[PDB]
Design a protein around this ligand. Sequence first.
Ligand SMILES: O=c1ccn([C@H]2C[C@H](O)[C@@H](COP(=O)(O)NP(=O)(O)OP(=O)(O)O)O2)c(=O)[nH]1
Ligand SMILES: O=c1ccn([C@H]2C[C@H](O)[C@@H](COP(=O)(O)NP(=O)(O)OP(=O)(O)O)O2)c(=O)[nH]1
Ligand SMILES: O=c1ccn([C@H]2C[C@H](O)[C@@H](COP(=O)(O)NP(=O)(O)OP(=O)(O)O)O2)c(=O)[nH]1
Ligand SMILES: [Mg+2]
Ligand SMILES: [Mg+2]
Ligand SMILES: [Mg+2]
Lengths: 113, 113, 113
Amino acid sequence: QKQPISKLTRATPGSAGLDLCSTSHTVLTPEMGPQALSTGIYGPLPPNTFGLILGRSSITMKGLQVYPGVIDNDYTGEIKIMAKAVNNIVTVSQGNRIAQLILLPLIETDNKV
Amino acid sequence: QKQPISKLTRATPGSAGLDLCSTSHTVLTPEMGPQALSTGIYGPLPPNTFGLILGRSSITMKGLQVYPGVIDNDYTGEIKIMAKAVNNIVTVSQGNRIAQLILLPLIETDNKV
Amino acid sequence: QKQPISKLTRATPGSAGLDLCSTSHTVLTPEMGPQALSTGIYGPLPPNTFGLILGRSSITMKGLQVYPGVIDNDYTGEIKIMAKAVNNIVTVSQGNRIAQLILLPLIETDNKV
Ligand SMILES: O=c1ccn([C@H]2C[C@H](O)[C@@H](COP(=O)(O)NP(=O)(O)OP(=O)(O)O)O2)c(=O)[nH]1
Ligand SMILES: O=c1ccn([C@H]2C[C@H](O)[C@@H](COP(=O)(O)NP(=O)(O)OP(=O)(O)O)O2)c(=O)[nH]1
Ligand SMILES: O=c1ccn([C@H]2C[C@H](O)[C@@H](COP(=O)(O)NP(=O)(O)OP(=O)(O)O)O2)c(=O)[nH]1
Ligand SMILES: [Mg+2]
Ligand SMILES: [Mg+2]
Ligand SMILES: [Mg+2]
């Protein structure tokens, strides 16, 4: 079954991000370029917020780049992590925390849709 | 003529980002490194906000990395997209939506200027 | 001695970011992959805020990629800049402004810790 964002956990009370884990074992090589890693977690977001997926610094330092991703407030699909091995072969084990979801205020503007 | 940020459009009502298109046809190769793509859109931003330029996930997944860029509230120059082809040759057609502008609250602090 | 975030400066009144400088001379090559650059600046952040470390566009355009980093509200360690030379050899002189700290509201949620 789909899991909502309310199922995510914070590492600590003062952690800005909600941790995102891949649900698959994935191996990445630099030549593969960007890959979208499955999380089994689904939008949408709390009212008046949007999300940003960012890397965890310990993962970034281990050579896996998470490309910052914008999660729209009303996206109801699966939140995937866009990732690339920078220089070396990187192996993601199932359940490893690979990224984090940050929630931010969605500012209203009069821009046309 | 310069176009202001109010001319940008959202893909959907609940889209966090305002789409940014290049005004030129540009081809990018990995060896070129970061390139600043013209948009013909100009700051400044709404009061008490700043901007962040981020990639669109469909573009990121096609091998074009947009480096997150900070747009200062009172910048009045042209908003450019900083982009790099990750692994392969990437071709941007004129008018293609390459990035998105997210607006965020500008927090005041007492840090010196 | 440790320096707090209140010691950072803005380039201009309307600058979104607080500039971060490396305290060391560092040379980076693409094959080195991500490196954590010392700043001598320490958390924590103002109440109800978290931080984001982002690149300065002039530095990004010179071939040094700063990986976006999340600074937790209650982190009390040293803020380091995660950086990689994209394509060429990059040299950071001591005191050069390499990145910027953006402060953002920390939204409360009921996610478990
Ligand atoms: O660019 C950065 C990013 C993070 N940091 C520090 C501050 C942040 O609060 C701390 C933890 O960052 P992340 O949560 O992104 N890293 P990770 O998930 O790997 O560690 P933790 O589980 O402790 O949160 O690392 C930096 O100094 N520079
Ligand atoms: O890292 C990400 C980024 C986006 N997404 C999903 C959520 C987001 O709302 C949706 C659309 O993202 P973008 O707007 O960044 N992509 P794009 O502009 O390519 O598609 P769209 O036109 O639908 O907005 O893709 C992820 O799952 N992971
Ligand atoms: O992706 C971007 C990032 C920045 N910019 C413009 C807007 C921003 O206000 C201006 C300055 O950006 P940064 O502060 O990130 N660059 P830098 O520190 O190199 O210049 P400055 O000292 O003037 O702030 O560059 C873009 O057009 N696209
Ligand atoms: Mg963390
Ligand atoms: Mg979009
Ligand atoms: Mg600056």
